[PDB]
From a paper:
The HCV NS3/4A protease – a chymotrypsin-like serine protease – is a prime therapeutic target that cleaves four known sites along the virally encoded polyprotein. The NS3/4A protease also hydrolyzes two human proteins, TRIF and MAVS, which are part of the innate immune system, thereby confounding the innate immune response to viral infection. In this study, we report that four chemically representative protease inhibitors – telaprevir, danoprevir, vaniprevir and MK-5172 – exhibit distinct susceptibilities to the protease variants R155K, A156T and D168A. To elucidate the underlying mechanism by which chemically diverse inhibitors bind to the wild-type protease and drug-resistant variants, crystal structures were determined for 16 inhibitor-protease complexes. These complexes include wild-type protease and resistant variants R155K, D168A and A156T each bound to telaprevir, danoprevir, vaniprevir and MK-5172, with resolutions ranging from 1.10–2.50 Å; S139A protease variants were used except for telaprevir, which requires covalent bond formation with the serine 139 for efficient binding.
However, the A156T mutation resulted in a steric clash with telaprevir's P2 moiety, causing the inhibitor to shift significantly; the inhibitor P2 moiety moved away from R155, losing van der Waals interactions with the protease. Notably, in the A156T-telaprevir complex the covalent bond between the ketoamide warhead and the catalytic serine was extended to greater than 2 Å, suggesting a reduced capacity for covalent modification, consistent with the large loss in potency against A156T. Thus, while telaprevir's flexibility allows adaptation to D168A, it cannot accommodate the disruption by R155K or A156T. Telaprevir and other linear ketoamide drugs select for A156T variants by direct steric clashes, while linear (BI 201335) and macrocyclic drugs (danoprevir, vaniprevir, TMC435) with large P2 moieties select for D168A variants by disrupting favorable stacking interactions with R155.
Numbering used by the authors: 982 to 1180
The structure:
Amino acid sequence: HMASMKKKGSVVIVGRINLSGDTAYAQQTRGEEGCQETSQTGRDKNQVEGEVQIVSTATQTFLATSINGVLWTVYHGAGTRTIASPKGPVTQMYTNVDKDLVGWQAPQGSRSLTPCTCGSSDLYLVTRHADVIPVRRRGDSRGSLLSPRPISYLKGSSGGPLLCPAGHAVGIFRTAVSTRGVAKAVDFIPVESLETTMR
Ligand SMILES: CCC[C@H](NC(=O)[C@@H]1[C@H]2CCC[C@H]2CN1C(=O)[C@@H](NC(=O)[C@@H](NC(=O)c1cnccn1)C1CCCCC1)C(C)(C)C)[C@@H](O)C(=O)NC1CC1
Ligand SMILES: [Zn+2]
């Protein structure tokens, strides 16, 4: 009974959204069997690159975004889980259920986005399928899609970035705002909220 007590696995990086060139595209770096093993050991020796990682638990796949040397994602996806790394599991450096926000030290090899300082309300959401979707900022933590999509389109994009025209991080996508299955808007965690969390 106490001896049969299992532990939750680590979050595992299973790919990335490549934003380095003219074309955004998703790359897978680990398959399902490797993911399952790595989640249990917490030992991930794969090379990490890029700003936006595709991450998985046993039950969910979603995104994580590096900003100012922290890999950030949503609490509703990651919970309090460690992330797998070459040295074994790494404990969260930030955990905030009230903001729906968690973060780990950014993996060696990752690149970070810089927080936006320009005040622009013309944003771009990067999805787990590497779509770059225009979003008009409508408040501190909400934006509207210029073209509404079924919510399926956004499933698994939580933890991904909203970017300004200059490619700086404005926020982390948290949840879709939907009506009868159509997403018309998105809620996000503003980068200023991350910056406060960091000090
Ligand atoms: C929504 C797309 C991204 C996913 N976000 C989520 O799953 C978040 C989580 C936040 C905590 C509760 C969950 C519900 N959720 C939602 O976005 C859900 N949105 C909602 O439930 C939104 N509510 C509504 O759309 C609504 C409200 N009244 C009546 C009818 N519909 C609320 C509205 C208030 C602000 C917050 C959003 C949705 C779209 C799935 C039904 C993300 O978790 C993800 O990447 N998923 C993949 C693994 C399956
Ligand atoms: Zn900016």
